[PDB]
Amino acid sequence: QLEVALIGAGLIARLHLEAWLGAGAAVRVYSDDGRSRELAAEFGAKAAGSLEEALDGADAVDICTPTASHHEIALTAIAAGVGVVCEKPLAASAEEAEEIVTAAERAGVRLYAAHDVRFAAPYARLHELVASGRLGEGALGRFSFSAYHPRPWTGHASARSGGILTDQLLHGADLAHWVFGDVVRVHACYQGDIATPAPEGAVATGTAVLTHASGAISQVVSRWTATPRPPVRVAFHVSGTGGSVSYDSEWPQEVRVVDGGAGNFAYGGPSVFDTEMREFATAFAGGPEPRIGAKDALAAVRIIHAAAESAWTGRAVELPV
Amino acid sequence: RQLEVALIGAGLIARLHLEAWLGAGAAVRVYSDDGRSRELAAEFGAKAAGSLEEALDGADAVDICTPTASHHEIALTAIAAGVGVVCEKPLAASAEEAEEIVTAAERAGVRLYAAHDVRFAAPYARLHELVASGRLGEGALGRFSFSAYHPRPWTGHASARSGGILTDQLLHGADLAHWVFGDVVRVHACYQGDIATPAPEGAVATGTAVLTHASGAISQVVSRWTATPRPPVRVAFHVSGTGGSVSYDSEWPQEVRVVDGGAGNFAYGGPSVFDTEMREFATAFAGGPEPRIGAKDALAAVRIIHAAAESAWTGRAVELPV
Amino acid sequence: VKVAILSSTPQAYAGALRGLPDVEVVAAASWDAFEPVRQAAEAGARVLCEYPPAAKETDLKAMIDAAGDRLTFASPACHGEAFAVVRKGIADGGIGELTTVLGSVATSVDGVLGAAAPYLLDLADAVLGGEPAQQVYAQTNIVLSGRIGESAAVLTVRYRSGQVASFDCRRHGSATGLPAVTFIGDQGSVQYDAGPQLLGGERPELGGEDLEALMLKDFLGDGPGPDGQAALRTFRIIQAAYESAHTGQPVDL
Amino acid sequence: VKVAILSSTPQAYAGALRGLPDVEVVAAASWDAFEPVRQAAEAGARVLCEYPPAAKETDLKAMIDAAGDRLTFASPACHGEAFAVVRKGIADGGIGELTTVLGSVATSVDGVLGAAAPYLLDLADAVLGGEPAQQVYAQTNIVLSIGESAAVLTVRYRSGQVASFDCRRHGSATGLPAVTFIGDQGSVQYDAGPQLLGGERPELGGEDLEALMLKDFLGAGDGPGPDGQAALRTFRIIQAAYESAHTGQPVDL
Ligand SMILES: C/C1=C/C=C/[C@H](C)[C@H](O)[C@@H](C)[C@@H](O)[C@@H](C)[C@H](O)[C@H](C)[C@@H](O)[C@@H](C)/C=C(\C)C(=O)c2c(O)c(C)c(O)c3c2C(=O)C=C(NC1=O)C3=O
Ligand SMILES: C/C1=C/C=C/[C@H](C)[C@H](O)[C@@H](C)[C@@H](O)[C@@H](C)[C@H](O)[C@H](C)[C@@H](O)[C@@H](C)/C=C(\C)C(=O)c2c(O)c(C)c(O)c3c2C(=O)C=C(NC1=O)C3=O
Ligand SMILES: NC(=O)c1ccc[n+]([C@@H]2O[C@H](COP(=O)([O-])OP(=O)(O)OC[C@H]3O[C@@H](n4cnc5c(N)ncnc54)[C@H](O)[C@@H]3O)[C@@H](O)[C@H]2O)c1
């Protein structure tokens, strides 16, 4: 059985814990708040008293801690020979992220990031179409990710860094990069009070224009809304020489209440976390490489920091290949 | 000169028709036995007539916006005075009454139409345009569904044997099926719910009918009254022929769509179907081309809904000779 | 485990079954020439079968006699996690008292009434609690292109409870056979669509669950598809529907 | 009413207008030779005008000067009753404080930024009450089948509001815009070309925008479409966009 050290005991860790176990892994949980004790008992997992103890005998570490702590936790696991899956964004700076990528490559350990969007059906199918040549040469894409934030942002993040919009932009930036390739130019306008700490329901809108090495262009809109009406909406429309494909998460899928307003028919498809951890587990057990690699984790961090800088300085940011 | 329209009745449909006739450039005389016509006429600047006879005197057409059971005498009175007829659906309360009106209108050489509103709204008119112009090939199969919450009580009287509240809703789908696929030669229906009237606002019933058309095409028509206005109305259809399929869902967003945030002050229903309807009828009664619905269509609709109610009652399919 | 397949597309299911380990496909055939599968059933094989044609009830009984509970009827959409959600929501009263089932399916297989309507009736039977039918009415035509048998059909079922089902079927060369079913109760309605649109565009992309994988899982391991009695109820519906399409009047059962 | 038309399809408009009661068309030309329309404007005609090519700013300013408040620019989606609903609802606070305008358009015409983005900017300008633009960023490419076949531009207004629009070429596109208005309490979409019917060949819905536009051109009040100053605002934005697509940096206005 694959052995996974899960660091953190918050909401993401709890979702990852359940998915690892559902994939067949054995897990040990460590968080610096002590809450890893009762978290592991709730799910039947192991509790470790330290990161070193959690890493001792581990095949992989799953870092589900605040972003600023990703850099040293990842570097510790890599030096110990433990492969890494890290929650997004990979690190708190593009420079920290590159350092993790280089260390993992020289130590020859696997390095993945949990870019969840890639593991849900509309986005995986979009990449499949584009990569198989079905759309021809990509030319133009619009992506929007919009949600009500139901918890407060308790960490400290400046407006210059993009604050809350950086969180929402990582989905769209990663999707555009996945679909159209390397981004060579970034422009963004950020609207709203975006620094954290910030409350549930804080409102902000960020509009980004990404130019890709191929010449394709992506418009990525990232939004936090005041109310869960709806809780989440994603939409996209992608055009190439071979045609166009579109998506709206509001469209009805397998289960649709047509009238009367019943609320007991919730269905959201397969959990992205089940799909994610299963694919990662398979990779760590010698299987094929997952749909996201170290260089993707690094690309996303670079894009969101260039967009934050563009919004702050009013300049477009060039990222030559 | 201005077209002269006698409007009989002063309920809600009469009020909607009046606004549309005036918008079409016509001159209207309103009359109802209960006297409501005079305040209706005054609010819109139309003439209040003092009797049916005076409403008809010098009119080019009469718009019959009274309960179904009264259509027959009113229409015959109008035909005898040389006045053309637009009748609220259905044309009359029985097939036999409808035939007498159709026959009388022909013998007198005056126009006879029924207000089958569905034909005058864009999704259904476009579907018929696709079908009639050959873009679907030969029609094979169609499903239609008309569902709404009834936001006021049914105060008139109708029996379960007559199909009751389901008859009202079936008119739309039966007419649409006949319009797109041709004459109906066989009807089977199952009616569910307490369907007699008087009935309260929000009464629930479901009617499922299968129509076989002279061409061999088949349509499934579902008519529903719902418990809540969630939504107030939903219409859906899917039609397939040798040239392809055409679909519609009234829940699809159109020109105006609140995407998030719950705003309620963005209602937009499209152009008024009544403006489109009365302008087309106005043009016909003024000597122009015939409208998209004729006398034989009005009679068809009566025949089909009475065949359906009979099928629902006896458990047999009902044939309709061409 | 030894396995046999009865379907119009036997090479389809045989390929997926061989692709899994510990399983061996000893026979695969169409209901036209079912005997190699019947002898495999007698010899102990698990048999996954599509619904037989309405004309071959004696072949159906021979398969029941040969396999007993080793016979499993293929009804992919019954295995959706989405369908479990719908059944539970309805049983919990989410739509009030259930009155009416509607639905539509398109298939590429000729004779769409016998070929595709069982997929809708299976979903109806699950949610109706196996209620028996009191009458069946149907009409068919051959307007749309096909080889043999009707290319469009509508049937309405009146159940002894007074509930109603009504389904429309049509042939099309690029159809999937994936049904969409609508359950109407006196407080609302909910739709289960086994083949929703995932992506729009000039060539729309079909969403949905991996119903093949789920159905084979159950068959290699009593699940939510029709058991034998449910299949026989539906097959009797089908026979009655063909009779009604000829007489032009409902058939009493 | 004396009217003149300046468009790429001048006879199509002249034929729709002439013979109408109280209406006569005193000049109709394309921007390639606009002198008779300028002359009609100086003599007092009202003029319906299409956005000019990027090289004719001087001729645009001449028309603004000759026609004054008798100049209307052709922007069909501005005239929808649906747009009046959207404008009213936003004004009444339906989405809270308006911050952002997004929108997409597809055209068959080459050079999609200059050719199609004004239809989007006109809708923004109406809702923003002519708010001045401060800075524009844009990118273009020729990936899809002279002149750019895809474009994205972002406009920063001096209010701090933001608009961002994407344009693309397709041979079967209709040029009808769809615009989304985002405020701090919600967002609302005006789609001048929604899908009315689905199937293999979807049908376009929408209003008869050309007829409503000509009705407003021939009418009395202030129409909902762009006047001369609005056209010049939007023209300047486009020219700055083309400059930004060349420099790779935002351009100041
Ligand atoms: C526009 C979105 C598209 C996602 C699609 C994804 C395929 C899937 O459909 C996706 C919808 C599902 O998988 C969900 C289970 C999803 O996983 C959960 C919301 C998960 O994020 C929660 C643990 C997070 C919270 C509760 C938060 O508070 C929260 C955060 O703290 C931070 C730092 C964020 O950046 C976001 C959120 C949040 O809530 C919602 C967010 N945007 C979206 O989701 C964010 O970006
Ligand atoms: C499923 C429907 C589709 C109609 C589509 C129509 C072409 C157009 O698209 C449609 C959307 C619009 O025109 C409508 C707003 C139109 O204005 C209303 C129907 C109008 O009649 C109201 C005055 C009626 C009421 C208040 C009623 O109580 C009422 C009646 O008294 C009677 C005898 C009915 O038969 C119905 C109703 C009712 O409410 C709703 C009904 N079913 C539908 O409408 C009925 O059949
Ligand atoms: N879609 C998205 O963008 C998204 C969504 C959710 C979370 N995230 C990411 O996950 C991370 C935050 O996870 P969360 O949402 O569950 O926050 P959280 O506050 O709920 O979890 C923090 C957990 O990690 C523990 N912890 C903190 N520092 C630690 C350390 N040095 N060593 C061990 N444990 C430590 C804490 O005690 C706590 O249990 C961030 O990187 C955040 O960006 C991203």
Short mmCIF file of C-alpha atoms and ligand atoms in Angstrom, two decimals, chain A residues 11-12 15 87-88 116-120 123 144-153 164 166-169 171 223-224 231-234 271-273, ligand 1:
data_model
loop_
_atom_site.label_atom_id
_atom_site.label_comp_id
_atom_site.label_asym_id
_atom_site.label_seq_id
_atom_site.Cartn_x
_atom_site.Cartn_y
_atom_site.Cartn_z
CA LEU A 11 -10.82 21.74 4.77
CA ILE A 12 -8.58 20.75 1.84
CA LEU A 15 -11.07 16.38 1.40
CA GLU A 87 -1.95 22.27 -3.05
CA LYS A 88 -2.13 25.23 -5.45
CA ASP A 116 -8.19 20.48 -9.51
CA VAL A 117 -9.74 22.02 -12.66
CA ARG A 118 -7.83 19.59 -14.88
CA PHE A 119 -9.61 16.60 -13.29
CA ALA A 120 -13.23 17.64 -13.95
CA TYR A 123 -11.98 20.87 -18.84
CA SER A 144 -14.48 32.79 -16.44
CA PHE A 145 -14.39 31.45 -12.89
CA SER A 146 -16.80 33.04 -10.44
CA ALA A 147 -17.77 32.08 -6.90
CA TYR A 148 -19.09 33.14 -3.52
CA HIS A 149 -16.35 32.69 -0.91
CA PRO A 150 -18.13 31.07 2.07
CA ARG A 151 -15.25 31.30 4.60
CA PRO A 152 -13.16 34.32 5.60
CA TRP A 153 -9.66 34.88 4.28
CA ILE A 164 -8.18 37.30 -3.19
CA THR A 166 -4.86 35.54 -7.17
CA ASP A 167 -6.76 32.63 -5.57
CA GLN A 168 -9.49 32.68 -8.21
CA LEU A 169 -7.13 33.33 -11.13
CA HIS A 171 -7.97 28.02 -12.22
CA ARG A 223 -14.75 36.90 -9.73
CA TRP A 224 -15.73 36.68 -6.10
CA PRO A 231 -22.35 29.33 -5.34
CA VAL A 232 -20.07 28.70 -8.36
CA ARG A 233 -20.21 29.37 -12.08
CA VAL A 234 -17.62 28.48 -14.72
CA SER A 271 -15.44 14.13 -7.00
CA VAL A 272 -12.43 15.85 -8.56
CA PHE A 273 -10.48 14.86 -5.45
C1 LIG E 1 -14.98 29.06 -9.72
C2 LIG E 1 -14.53 27.68 -9.18
C3 LIG E 1 -14.35 26.61 -10.01
C4 LIG E 1 -13.88 25.20 -9.50
C5 LIG E 1 -14.24 24.09 -10.19
C6 LIG E 1 -13.83 22.68 -9.73
C7 LIG E 1 -13.71 21.77 -10.94
C8 LIG E 1 -14.95 22.06 -8.91
O1 LIG E 1 -16.11 22.17 -9.66
C9 LIG E 1 -15.18 22.72 -7.54
C10 LIG E 1 -16.36 23.65 -7.61
C11 LIG E 1 -15.49 21.61 -6.52
O2 LIG E 1 -14.53 20.60 -6.60
C12 LIG E 1 -15.56 22.18 -5.10
C13 LIG E 1 -15.70 21.04 -4.12
C14 LIG E 1 -14.28 22.96 -4.73
O3 LIG E 1 -13.26 22.04 -4.70
C15 LIG E 1 -14.45 23.62 -3.34
C16 LIG E 1 -15.16 24.95 -3.47
C17 LIG E 1 -13.10 23.83 -2.63
O4 LIG E 1 -12.32 24.79 -3.28
C18 LIG E 1 -13.32 24.30 -1.19
C19 LIG E 1 -12.44 23.41 -0.34
C20 LIG E 1 -12.88 25.78 -1.02
C21 LIG E 1 -13.59 26.69 -0.25
C22 LIG E 1 -14.86 26.24 0.51
C23 LIG E 1 -13.06 28.17 -0.15
O5 LIG E 1 -13.31 28.85 0.79
C24 LIG E 1 -12.11 28.63 -1.32
C25 LIG E 1 -10.79 28.98 -0.95
O6 LIG E 1 -10.44 28.95 0.41
C26 LIG E 1 -9.83 29.38 -1.92
C27 LIG E 1 -8.40 29.75 -1.46
C28 LIG E 1 -10.19 29.40 -3.30
O7 LIG E 1 -9.27 29.79 -4.27
C29 LIG E 1 -11.53 29.04 -3.69
C30 LIG E 1 -12.50 28.65 -2.71
C31 LIG E 1 -13.94 28.27 -3.16
O8 LIG E 1 -14.78 27.95 -2.39
C32 LIG E 1 -14.32 28.31 -4.62
C33 LIG E 1 -13.30 28.72 -5.63
N1 LIG E 1 -13.62 28.76 -7.06
C34 LIG E 1 -14.23 27.59 -7.67
O9 LIG E 1 -14.46 26.61 -7.02
C35 LIG E 1 -11.90 29.08 -5.21
O10 LIG E 1 -11.11 29.39 -6.05
#
